[PDB]
Enzyme design. Structure first.
Site, PDB file in Angstrom:
ATOM      1  N   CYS A 104       6.294   7.431  -6.286  1.00 61.75           N
ATOM      2  CA  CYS A 104       5.412   6.280  -6.328  1.00 61.75           C
ATOM      3  C   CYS A 104       6.041   5.088  -6.982  1.00 61.75           C
ATOM      4  CB  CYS A 104       4.025   6.628  -7.056  1.00 61.75           C
ATOM      5  SG  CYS A 104       3.003   5.172  -7.257  1.00 61.75           S
ATOM      6  N   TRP A 127      -3.572   0.087  -4.186  1.00 63.43           N
ATOM      7  CA  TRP A 127      -3.546  -1.019  -3.207  1.00 63.43           C
ATOM      8  C   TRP A 127      -2.198  -0.966  -2.532  1.00 63.43           C
ATOM      9  CZ3 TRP A 127      -4.245  -2.313  -8.515  1.00 63.43           C
ATOM     10  CH2 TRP A 127      -3.101  -2.735  -9.207  1.00 63.43           C
ATOM     11  N   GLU A 130       4.183  -0.735   3.967  1.00 66.66           N
ATOM     12  CA  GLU A 130       3.495   0.468   4.390  1.00 66.66           C
ATOM     13  C   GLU A 130       2.733   0.266   5.707  1.00 66.66           C
ATOM     14  OE1 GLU A 130       1.524   2.984   1.207  1.00 66.66           O
ATOM     15  OE2 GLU A 130       1.696   1.073   0.096  1.00 66.66           O
TER      16      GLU A 130
END
Ligand code: HEM
Ligand code: HEM
Ligand SMILES: Cc1cc(N)nc(CCc2cncc([C@@H](CN)Cc3cc(C)cc(N)n3)c2)c1
Ligand SMILES: Cc1cc(N)nc(CCc2cncc([C@@H](CN)Cc3cc(C)cc(N)n3)c2)c1
Ligand SMILES: C[C@H](O)[C@H](O)[C@H]1CNc2nc(N)[nH]c(=O)c2N1
Ligand SMILES: C[C@H](O)[C@H](O)[C@H]1CNc2nc(N)[nH]c(=O)c2N1
Ligand SMILES: [Zn+2]
Lengths: 407, 411
Positions: A106, A278, A283
Site C-alpha cells: 500500500c 481514496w 488505478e
C-alpha cells in the site's frame, strides 16, 4: 541481519531492523525469488495473543506494567477456558491501524493512523451487515471529501460460522458475456455477476451497473442487498482539452473499498472487514480503463485522437494512456471528489518510509506494487530499494467464498 | 518439484522445472524478499565440480553426453586443474558459455536474440594497447554503420586475482560529467567520478555536454592506460522530434551502441573480469532513464516548458506528457538515421514469446520483473502482467566492484 536500503536517485541509505520481527513467510527462498507472484486451536493462539499484547502495551509505554501482566493473565485464562478471546476496543483499533501500517503493497500508508474503525462485532444477520456497510459507505464518502474507514464484523470461531462479504470490493461494476462473444461491463466481474443473477439479482444488463452486495452472516448462505443508489458517488469522465472525451460515456465510482481480505489481529481472524480510502488516479485510468482484460479502451481513445496506430513505435498507446489519466484526475478534481495523482502519492510514500525507518526501524514495502503502472521511473519510489517482509497484525488474501461455501 | 507462473492478462500458466538447476543464491530468504535490492581467489577444491557441471551441460547441449569425447575432456580438465590449478576452455566451450551467460541473464529483456552473439576471443591479449585494438574492432563490428550486431569480446581469465584484466569504463561508450564549482553538473552526472579519474590519468577534457569518454584499460593487473576511441568509430544520433521542430534545438544526441564493460563473465568456475558485450538500445533506456532521471540529464522541465504544459500542479501530468514526447523523439531519430533500436512494446512482446518458448524447450526462464518491466507505461506492456521466477543459473554475468576501489597502484 541488519539490512541497508539505498535510494539510487538521492543516495540516502536507511538501516532496516524491523524485519527481524517478521512473522510470516514470503514465498522466497535462498534459491528463488517470488517477488512477482501475486499469491505466493488453543496452543498456537496463546503465543499470537502474547506477541500482540506485548506490542500493544509497548506502544502505550506500559510494557511490563501490572496492567500489561493482568491483561496477558486474563487473555490466557480466557483462551484456556473458551478457546478464543475478545479484543478490547482499544486493542481492536490499534490492531486495525497496524494491519494498514503493515500492508506492504500500500502506497498510501502515510495516512495509516487516521483510520476510523467501526466495530461491528455485535452484528448477527446479513441485514445487520448491510446496514453497517451502508453507514461505512456514507461516512467514508462524505460528499466527496473521502475519509478512510474499516468495518469489522465478528471474528472466526470454528470456521463453520464465518462472516464474509462475497464481493471483492463494496462497489464494482457488473460483467456479462454476450451472444456477440464479447463482454459488456467489467470483464473482471463476470463470474461474480453470474452468482448474483443465480442468487436472484435482476441484472439491468448495462456497461456500468453497480453490483449488489452478497453478504454472509454466521456461516449462513449469503443474501443479496442493493446499496442505496444515492450512497454510491460516481464521476462521469471528461477531458479538459478534448471535448469528444465525454462522448465515450465513461464513469467510475469515487470509493475504493476492499471487502474480501482477512484481518488478522493477535491470532484472531476477522474474515469480513471491509476497508476503504481514496483512489490514486492510475488505478482507474491505467488499470481499470486500459488493461486489455478490463475496459480496454486504449484503441478507441487513440482513434479519436487520430494518432498513427500503424506502428507500435509511434507510442500511440503511451500518448492515449497519458490523456486518459489526465481525464480521470481532472474529472475527480472538478467534481470535488478526493483523488491523488501518482506523483504526489509516491512522494508522500517516500516521506512515510523515512518516518517509519526513523521512528520504527523499517517499513515493509513491495516494490512491484508500490511503483505506479505508468511512468514508473519518474516517481521517486522507482529509485528506492525496499525490503518486503510480513508483520502482524496484517491483511491477508483469502479464497473466494463460492469455492469454500457448502450451501 | 514444479513451480507455476501465471499471466494475469491471458490466464496462461507455465510450469518451471529449470529452477531445480540453480545453485547461486538470490539475497532472499523465507523471511525477507530482496527482489528490489540493486546488488543483493578460488581453490582447485571448488573448481573441478564447477568445471564438471559446465562440461556436462555443454556435452548434453551437443548430444554427446557421456561420450568418449566427453569423458576425455573431463579427464583432461581434471589433470590440468591439479597440475596448473586452473584450466583453459576450448573455443567452442567459450562460445557456448558466453551465449548461456546471456540466455541466463534474468534482468535482460532482449534475450530472444541470445543465440545470435558474435564472440571475439581475446584470450591471447597481453597489454592495454592490445585491449584497445580488440575493443576498437568490437565497436566497429558491432556498430556495422547502424545495423547493429550483438557481440562480446573476452579477455584473459582471472588467475591469482593479482593479474586481472579490467575495463575501468562501466560502458565502452559514455559521456563525461563535470561537477562545476556552483554545484551544477555539465554533461552526464552518472559519470562524474569516472571523468575525474580520467582527467587525473591525463585526459584533456573538452568540457562539453556530450564528450565521449576515453577508455581506461588495465591488462594483467597493471595500472590502467588511457586511449581515445577513434571518433569515426562512435556512431551518434542527434535527437529531433517528428512534429516539434524546436526539439532539435535542445541540442540532444545519444550514441548508438550500448556496451557493458564492467561485468564479470563466469564459465565453469573460470572468471573473465573483462568481457565487454553490446547489443542495441530499447528506446526507454535513453528516453526515460538517460534523459529524464533527476540524477541524469534531467530534461523533463525544459521539454515541458517548450510544450507549454501546465506545470503548476503535478496532477496535470505534465511530466508524463513531456516523457512520452521525448521517447517518440528518440525512436524517430534512431529510425530516421537507420540505427537499430527497439521500442518497449515490441521488446516486451518479443520477450514474452521468448519466455514461453524457453519454458517449453528448457523448463524455465529466470526473469527479474523489477528490471524487465519498462520504466514508463509499465502495465500497457505484457511483461507487467506476467509472473516471473528469479533465480541464478551459470554461466552468468555478475556485478564486480569498480576497479578504482580495489586496484593496487604500481605507480
Ligand atoms: C487513503 C488512501 C489510500 C491510497 C491512496 C491507497 C493506495 C493504494 C494502492 C494504489 C494500492 C494498490 C491497489 C491496486 O493495485 O489494486 C493499495 C493497496 C492496498 N492498500 Fe491502500 N491506499 C489507501 C488506503 C488504504 C486503507 C484505509 C487500507 C486499509 C485500512 C489500505 C490497505 C491496502 C492493502 C491491504 C492493499 C493491498 C490490496 C491487495 O492486495 O489487493 N489502504 N493501496
Ligand atoms: C540485443 C539487444 C538487447 C536488448 C534490446 C537488451 C535489452 C536490455 C535492457 C533494456 C536491459 C536493462 C538495461 C538497463 O536498465 O540499464 C538489459 C540488461 C542486460 N542485458 Fe541486455 N539487451 C540486449 C542484448 C544483450 C547482450 C548482447 C547481452 C550480453 C551478451 C546482454 C546482457 C544483459 C545483462 C547482463 C543485463 C543486466 C545489466 C546490468 O545488471 O546492469 N544483453 N538488456
Ligand atoms: C483501500 C484501497 C485504496 C485504493 N486507493 N485502492 C484500492 C484498490 C483495491 C483493488 C481494486 N481492484 C483490484 C484489486 C486487485 C489488485 N489490483 C485485487 C487482487 C487480486 C489478486 C489476484 C490478488 C490480490 N492480492 N489482490 C485491488 C484499495
Ligand atoms: C548489452 C546492452 C543492451 C541494451 N539494450 N542496454 C544495455 C544497457 C546497459 C546499462 C547502461 N547504463 C546503465 C546501466 C546500469 C543499470 N541501469 C548499470 C548498473 C548499475 C548498478 C548500480 C547495478 C547494476 N547491476 N548495473 C546499464 C546493455
Ligand atoms: C504479475 C505481477 O505481480 C502483477 O501483474 C502485479 C504487478 N504490480 C501490481 N501493482 C499493483 N499496485 N497492483 C497490481 O494489481 C499489480 N499487479
Ligand atoms: C531500487 C530499484 O531496484 C532500481 O531503481 C531498479 C528498478 N528497475 C530497473 N530496471 C532496469 N531495467 N534498470 C535499472 O537500473 C533499474 N533500477
Ligand atoms: Zn524475493
Amino acid at each position: 541481519r541488519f539490512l541497508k536500503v539505498k535510494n539510487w536517485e538521492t543516495d540516502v541509505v536507511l538501516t532496516d531492523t524491523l524485519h527481524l520481527k517478521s512473522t510470516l513467510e514470503t514465498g522466497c527462498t535462498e534459491h528463488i525469488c517470488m517477488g512477482s507472484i501475486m499469491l505466493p486451536t488453543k496452543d498456537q493462539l496463546f503465543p499470537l495473543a502474547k506477541e500482540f499484547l506485548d506490542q500493544y502495551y509497548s506502544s502505550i509505554k506500559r510494557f511490563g506494567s501490572k496492567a500489561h501482566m493482568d491483561r496477558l493473565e486474563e487473555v490466557n485464562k480466557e483462551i484456556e477456558s473458551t478457546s478464543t478471546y475478545q479484543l478490547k476496543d482499544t486493542e481492536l483499533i490499534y490492531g486495525a491501524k497496524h494491519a494498514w501500517r503493515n500492508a506492504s503493497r500500500c502506497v498510501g500508508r502515510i495516512q495509516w493512523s487516521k483510520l476510523q474503525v467501526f466495530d461491528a462485532r455485535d452484528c448477527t444477520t446479513a441485514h445487520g451487515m448491510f446496514n453497517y456497510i451502508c453507514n461505512h459507505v456514507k461516512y467514508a464518502t462524505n460528499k466527496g471529501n473521502l475519509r478512510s474507514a474499516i468495518t469489522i464484523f465478528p471474528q472466526r470461531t470454528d470456521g463453520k460460522h464465518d462472516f464474509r462479504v462475497w464481493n471483492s470490493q463494496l462497489i464494482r461494476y457488473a460483467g456479462y458475456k454476450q451472444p456477440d462473444g464479447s463482454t459488456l461491463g467489467d470483464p473482471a466481474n463476470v463470474q461474480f455477476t453470474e452468482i448474483c443473477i443465480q442468487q436472484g439479482w435482476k441484472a439491468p444488463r448495462g456497461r456500468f451497473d453497480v453490483l449488489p452486495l452478497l453478504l454472509q452472516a454466521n456461516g449462513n448462505d449469503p443474501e443479496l442487498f442493493q446499496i442505496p443508489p444515492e450512497l454510491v458517488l460516481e464521476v462521469p469522465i471528461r477531458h479538459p482539452k478534448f471535448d469528444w472525451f465525454k462522448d465515450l460515456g465513461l464513469k467510475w465510482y469515487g470509493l475504493p473499498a476492499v471487502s474480501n481480505m482477512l484481518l488478522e489481529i493477535g491470532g484472531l481472524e476477522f474474515s469480513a472487514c471491509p476497508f476503504s480510502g481514496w483512489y490514486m488516479g492510475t488505478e482507474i485510468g491505467v488499470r481499470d480503463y486500459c488493461d486489455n482484460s478490463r475496459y480496454n479502451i486504449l484503441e478507441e481513445v487513440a482513434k479519436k485522437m487520430d494518432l498513427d496506430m500503424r506502428k507500435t513505435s509511434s507510442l500511440w498507446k503511451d500518448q492515449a494512456l497519458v490523456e486518459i489519466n489526465i481525464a480521470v484526475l481532472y474529472s475527480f478534481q472538478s467534481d470535488k471528489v478526493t483523488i491523488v495523482d501518482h506523483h504526489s502519492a509516491t512522494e508522500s510514500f517516500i516521506k512515510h518510509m523515512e518516518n517509519e525507518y526513523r521512528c520504527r526501524g523499517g517499513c515493509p514495502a513491495d516494490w512491484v506494487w508500490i511503483v505506479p503502472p505508468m511512468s514508473g521511473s519518474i516517481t521517486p519510489v522507482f529509485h528506492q530499494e525496499m525490503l518486503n517482509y510480513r508483520l502482524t497484525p496484517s491483511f491477508e488474501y483469502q479464497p473466494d467464498p463460492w469455492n469454500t461455501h457448502v450451501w
